Write a protein that binds this ligand. Structure first.
Ligand SMILES: [Mg+2]
Ligand SMILES: [Mg+2]
Ligand SMILES: [Mg+2]
Ligand SMILES: [Mg+2]
Ligand SMILES: [Mg+2]
Ligand SMILES: [Mg+2]
Ligand SMILES: [Mg+2]
Ligand SMILES: [Mg+2]
Ligand SMILES: [Mg+2]
Ligand SMILES: [Mg+2]
Ligand SMILES: [Mg+2]
Ligand SMILES: [Mg+2]
Ligand SMILES: [Mg+2]
Ligand SMILES: [Mg+2]
Ligand SMILES: [Mg+2]
Ligand SMILES: [Mg+2]
Ligand SMILES: [Mg+2]
Lengths: 209, 176, 142, 38
RNA sequence: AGAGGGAAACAACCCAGACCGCCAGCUAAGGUCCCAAAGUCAUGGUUAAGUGGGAAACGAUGUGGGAAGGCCCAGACAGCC
RNA sequence: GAUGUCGGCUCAUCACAUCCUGGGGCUGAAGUAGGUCCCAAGGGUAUGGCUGUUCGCCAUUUAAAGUGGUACGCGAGCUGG
RNA sequence: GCUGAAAGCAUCUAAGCACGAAACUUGCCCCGAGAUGAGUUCUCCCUGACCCUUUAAGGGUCCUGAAGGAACGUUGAAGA
């Protein structure tokens, strides 16, 4: 099934009447408007392109404005594609609401994880810290050895080193749908999802069980 | 050779149709079709079939002897068909066929259901017996092997699916 | 009087179609390598690409002798440690049938900038149809 | 299964068979006699 | 203290001893499908293992060739009663 | 006219003659549990006491506490017993 | 394992057919068209003169400056 594009509102909890606290992530899912439908004939694959939210007319460019005018929808804050499964039909301009997840039990949420910047090997790869005392000289959080002697004579590709951590696409799979509030454009999933408050999220039904 | 040098008499009621190498045979029990190897040409005649090694191939005589035995069973399948009987040995073991699916209870925690392939019939005269009937000798032998594979006869009490004819050789558990 | 040398500006190249159906992989590749390089033209010079453009159809129908259909292995290393990948012939055919002929010919071409330029004149197609009718390619019954 | 470099008939019922380029010994009487060259 | 050609690369192996020049020819070792100059040469065989393109004792109804031998239409060998 | 030499730490990587998990054959395989061989390298594969120790012994775990290569991997990374 | 000759039998194999493992190829996640073999789709923008010369993927002057971009500023759960 296709998914929806929402916004991470934040985290809260839902008390069940039998005394269980469920940590939930509130996802604001406004109406996703279909802006383009791709088919095998013209594009070689079946998919829809949706937009969501609103955008000030002074910030949309003429190339983007003409794309939205072609579909007859108001300009959103971005465009996202969803591969169509066999049997799903959508028309351009059609609006898709959060009630699509009315009977969906588990979802996969995709977002951009929070950026940690340049991270050391201790933080990024869970390397073990060397001794803090016992003679250690300037080598407390350094990665240690990075290879073998002359026989390889090089560092292997994919070696775990310090570098940029976070600020990348991350998918969390099989999150229980706690509540679908159609009239308020809310979707409550159990657990935590990638990204900071206010970031865009892509919510699809769970590809696994 | 010695098998290929014995012509196969095709009786009345059944017909043959040679189309280059692909051969087909119709009869009362059904119809069969089979492509023969390029190393052998089959010569049609009066109601008897002759196989010989086609020149240009060294293994013709070995390949010819197979086609002889192949269609010799093809003509038997379209007239008499083939039958194989399995007998279940062991308490609780009982089979029952409904439609083209066997319902075996071989002591597993789950029911095992084997789907018959198109062209093979089955029936259970009793709970601990199953008889299969069909035209193709190879396919009826394959199905019997699969049912036997669900619970192969163990060598201590003979329990499991076995062929009604074959003899299982048991052995005792050495004490002490 | 110096020996004649072909000039890249004045060399003419023809277009050809080859049906790889049933052809032996190697004995077809050598004939392609000759014509891609231009060894069949009297104006052949080593440092100039005087070859022809060749279109190969039905690349998935190419034939091999012996047990090579299941035993010929194509190795390649991804550059990552332990990244030695392999694929037999018939799965190369099932996945990327054009790669089989392209790999065979690539090994028979010279190595270097000119060799890579000759390889660009080879258009391999898995199916029977090609969209180079505008080039009017001549049937090469090889 | 005995996997050895020298396979031989161990009784009257042992039969030598070559399957897929591997010399094997199959015995309809003694399962201990089952061998394969390797 | 010896270049050249061959042996993929390879002082000591194989061919062969560089006075200089040539956009001439014939050969040696070694080669002649493509990389890469020259036979997708001819005739008759063998191999199916990519053997060729690494290895022993030993094992094996792989297969080719050869010379004999036992038994056999007084019915042998195999199968079946 | 210098290739820093044991062990530890950190970080590894490959081989398979496999320690666990997976698939099998045989068993002097009733079951449970084993023995042995074949296939299999995807992942996994202890913490302490003593000793500079590798190792080993011991205690207690674990599905298991694999064997080796890598300048007896790794001092322009640490340590210096 | 099935069928089955070579080898009147037998035989999982030689022709043919079926099973079969955390290995293999997929399936899951991420990167990814500098994939120079540089791909595809959608949308947007630009519709003036004139001279020279060896006359062509030529040079020059005047007019024109779009879509968009960059810069600058306020900044960010983005960041050396
Ligand atoms: Mg940040
Ligand atoms: Mg520590
Ligand atoms: Mg110091
Ligand atoms: Mg190197
Ligand atoms: Mg040389
Ligand atoms: Mg001299
Ligand atoms: Mg000459
Ligand atoms: Mg040549
Ligand atoms: Mg010839
Ligand atoms: Mg070899
Ligand atoms: Mg020095
Ligand atoms: Mg190691
Ligand atoms: Mg092994
Ligand atoms: Mg895998
Ligand atoms: Mg060391
Ligand atoms: Mg060092
Ligand atoms: Mg000291």
């Amino acid at each position: 099934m296709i998914g929806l594009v929402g916004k991470k509102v934040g985290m809260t909890r839902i008390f069940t009447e039998d005394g269980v606290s469920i940590p939930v992530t509130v996802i604001e899912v406004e109406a996703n408007r279909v802006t383009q439908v791709k088919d095998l004939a013209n594009d070689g694959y079946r998919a829809i392109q949706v937009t969501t939210g609103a955008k000030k007319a002074n910030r949309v460019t003429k190339p983007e404005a003409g794309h939205f005018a072609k579909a007859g929808v108001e300009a959103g804050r971005g465009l996202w594609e969803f591969r169509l499964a066999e049997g799903e039909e959508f028309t351009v301009g059609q609006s898709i609401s959060v009630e699509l997840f009315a009977d969906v039990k588990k979802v996969d949420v995709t977002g951009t994880s929070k950026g940690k910047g340049f991270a050391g090997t201790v933080k990024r790869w869970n390397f073990r810290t060397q001794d803090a005392t016992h003679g250690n000289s300037l080598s407390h959080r350094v990665p240690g050895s990075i290879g073998q002697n002359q026989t390889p004579g090089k560092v292997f590709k994919g070696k775990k080193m310090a570098g940029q951590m976070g600020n990348e696409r991350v998918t969390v799979q099989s999150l229980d749908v706690v509540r679908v509030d159609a009239e308020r454009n809310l979707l409550l999933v159990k657990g935590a999802v990638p990204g900071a408050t206010g970031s865009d999220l892509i919510v699809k039904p769970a590809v696994k069980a | 050779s010695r098998v290929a040098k014995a012509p196969v008499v095709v009786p009345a009621g059944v017909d043959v149709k040679i189309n280059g190498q692909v051969i087909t045979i119709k009869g009362k029990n059904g119809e069969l079709t089979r492509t023969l190897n390029d190393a052998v040409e089959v010569k049609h005649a009066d109601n008897t079939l002759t196989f010989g090694p086609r020149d240009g191939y060294a293994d013709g005589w070995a390949q010819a002897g197979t086609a002889r035995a192949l269609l010799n069973s093809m003509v038997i399948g379209v007239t008499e068909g083939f039958t194989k009987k399995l007998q279940l040995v062991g308490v609780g073991y009982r089979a029952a066929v409904k439609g083209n699916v066997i319902n075996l209870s071989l002591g597993f925690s789950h029911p095992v259901d084997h789907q018959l392939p198109a062209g093979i019939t089955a029936e259970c005269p009793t709970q601990t017996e199953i008889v299969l009937k069909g035209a193709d000798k190879q396919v009826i032998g394959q199905v019997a092997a699969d049912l036997r594979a669900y619970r192969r006869p163990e060598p201590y009490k003979g329990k499991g699916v076995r062929y009604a004819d074959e003899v299982v050789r048991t052995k005792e558990a050495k004490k002490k | 009087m110096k020996t004649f040398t072909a000039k890249p500006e004045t060399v003419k190249r023809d277009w050809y179609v080859v049906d790889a159906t049933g052809k032996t992989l190697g004995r077809l590749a050598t004939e392609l390598a000759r014509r891609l390089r231009g060894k069949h033209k009297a104006e052949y010079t080593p440092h100039v690409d005087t070859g022809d453009y060749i279109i190969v159809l039905n690349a998935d129908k190419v034939a091999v002798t012996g047990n090579k259909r299941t035993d010929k292995v194509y190795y390649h290393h991804t550059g990552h440690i332990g990244g030695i990948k392999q694929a037999t012939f018939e799965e190369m055919i099932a996945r990327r049938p054009e790669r089989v002929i392209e790999i065979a010919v690539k090994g028979m071409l010279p190595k270097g900038p000119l060799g890579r330029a000759m390889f660009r004149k080879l258009k391999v197609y898995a199916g029977n149809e090609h969209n180079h009718a505008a080039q009017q390619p001549q049937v090469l019954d090889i | 299964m005995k996997v050895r470099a020298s396979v031989k008939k161990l009784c009257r019922n042992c039969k030598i068979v070559k399957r897929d380029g591997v010399i094997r010994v199959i015995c309809s009487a003694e399962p201990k006699h089952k061998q394969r060259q390797g």
